[PDB]
Amino acid sequence: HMQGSLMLDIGGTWLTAEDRQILRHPEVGGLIIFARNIEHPAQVRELCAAIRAIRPDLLLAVDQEGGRVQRLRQGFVRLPAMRAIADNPNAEELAEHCGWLMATEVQAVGLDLSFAPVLDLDHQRSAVVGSRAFEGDPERAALLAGAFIRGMHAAGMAATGKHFPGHGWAEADSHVAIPEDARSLEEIRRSDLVPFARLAGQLDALMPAHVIYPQVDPQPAGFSRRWLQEILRGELKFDGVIFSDDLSMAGAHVVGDAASRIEAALAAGCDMGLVCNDRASAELALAALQRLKVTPPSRLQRMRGKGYANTDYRQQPRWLEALSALRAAQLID
């Protein structure tokens, strides 16, 4: 049997009958929630519990979109950004505390994971080459992201690096085209690939960049066997879960339907295809997996969270100690 699975989304803050029906198919392995599905933690918790009454094996993910959810949805813990964490003598400890807090709360509201950490590099073109600003300090990024992952793992959560092989040097010439990073594989290896290389052995999963690196492969990274098999699983020895990029095309189009795109993604080596914001495309992709008679990738359940839903997480000693450490570092309050 070919292996693969579909991760989809829903429209609202609760399940429709149509939602319930699509979630029952075994080829659906995951559901991702966004700010549009989130009112507050207790609602998120009950939405997750309702999904698990249908499918206890479903992987439930939140795209917090760069601390996005925590900002306008009341009641989630506000955590410092990595650049604020970096400017401390105990930055590693603080990054651990942040990974631990985020993963503890996300699992307390019934989710398995948050897609984190970001491994993309910030390149200041205003600075000149060689400086840790134009290059983006990839070793420091890998150090602090590795600490953040330790915190996530300590709370029971599997970690997903994004966006492989790194989109920090990609340039969006316009709105229609897929961004490109036209540097050689040697240049990429010594810069944006570094955090992925450093952490491939620690990460449980990766998400690909929606970028063409035309000197390496003509295809976006999520569809390239050279990127996913030769470099990621081969050179980086990565044995974790590979998510596709979003198989719904709304900004940078590619040809074919979600059916051919999920086929191409699994062909390149993805374990789980994502179809967001497009239920019609999700049903086309599901139909494709049904005709392929796929079974779930043996890797997939690595992403299941070892924590669990609970309402008392914030009164626990570890939670208070973690916040007290961020407070002592002047990062919160």
Catalytic residue list: 175, 245
Q: CA-CA distance, 8 to 258, in Å (whole number)?
A: 12
For residue 71, say whether it is annotated as part of any ligand binding site.
Answer: yes
Q: Name which of 22 and 116 has its Cβ closer to Cl ion.
A: 116
> Which one of the spans 34-42, 46-54, 161-169, 306-314 is the region binding Cl ion (CB under 5 A)?
306-314
- Kind of pairing, strands 217-220 and 212-213? antiparallel
Tell me, what amino acid is at 51?
I
Q: Name which of 195 and 307 has its Cβ closer to Cl ion.
A: 307
Told to check if 307 binds Cl ion by CB under 5 A, we report yes
C-beta of 155: minimal distance to Cl ion in Å?
6
5 strand-pairing partners: 272
> What SS3 class is residue 272?
strand
> Which one of the spans 12-20, 74-82, 154-162, 227-235 is the region binding Cl ion (CB under 5 A)?
154-162
- Of 205-264, binders to Cl ion (CB under 5 A) are none
Tell me, what amino acid is at 160?
T
Q: Name which of 112 and 278 has its Cβ closer to Cl ion.
A: 112
Chain position carrying tokens 């940078």:
252
Name the DSSP letter for residue 315.
G
Q: Is 234 exposed, middle or buried (0-12, 13-18, 19+ CB in 10 A)?
A: exposed
Q: Please report the sign of the dihedral spanned by the C-alpha atoms of residue 331, residue 64, residue 152, residue 92.
A: negative
For residue 163, say whether it is annotated as part of any ligand binding site.
Answer: yes
Q: CA-CA distance, 203 to 218, in Å (whole number)?
A: 26
> Which one of the spans 145-153, 199-207, 220-228, 298-306 is the region binding Cl ion (CB under 5 A)?
298-306
Per-residue tokens: 159: 């970690």
Are 205 and 239 contacting, i.e. CB atoms less than 8 angstroms apart? no
Told to check if 156 binds Cl ion by CB under 5 A, we report yes
Residue nearest to Cl ion (CB): 156
C-beta of 203: minimal distance to Cl ion in Å?
18
For residue 63, say whether it is annotated as part of any ligand binding site.
Answer: yes
- Kind of pairing, strands 160-164 and 205-208? parallel
Count of residues of this chain found to bind Cl ion when the rule CB under 5 A is applied: 3
| 165: preceding bond cis by omega (within 30 degrees) | yes
Q: Name which of 132 and 306 has its Cβ closer to Cl ion.
A: 306
Q: Is 13 exposed, middle or buried (0-12, 13-18, 19+ CB in 10 A)?
A: middle
C-beta of 84: minimal distance to Cl ion in Å?
26
Q: Name which of 156 and 296 has its Cβ closer to Cl ion.
A: 156
Are 143 and 151 contacting, i.e. CB atoms less than 8 angstroms apart? no
Told to check if 310 binds Cl ion by CB under 5 A, we report no
Are 97 and 36 contacting, i.e. CB atoms less than 8 angstroms apart? no
> Which one of the spans 29-37, 54-62, 155-163, 272-280 is the region binding Cl ion (CB under 5 A)?
155-163
**Binding-site positions for substrate:** 63, 71, 132, 162-163
**Binding-site positions:** 63, 71, 132, 162-163
Binding site for Cl ion (CB under 5 A): 156, 306-307
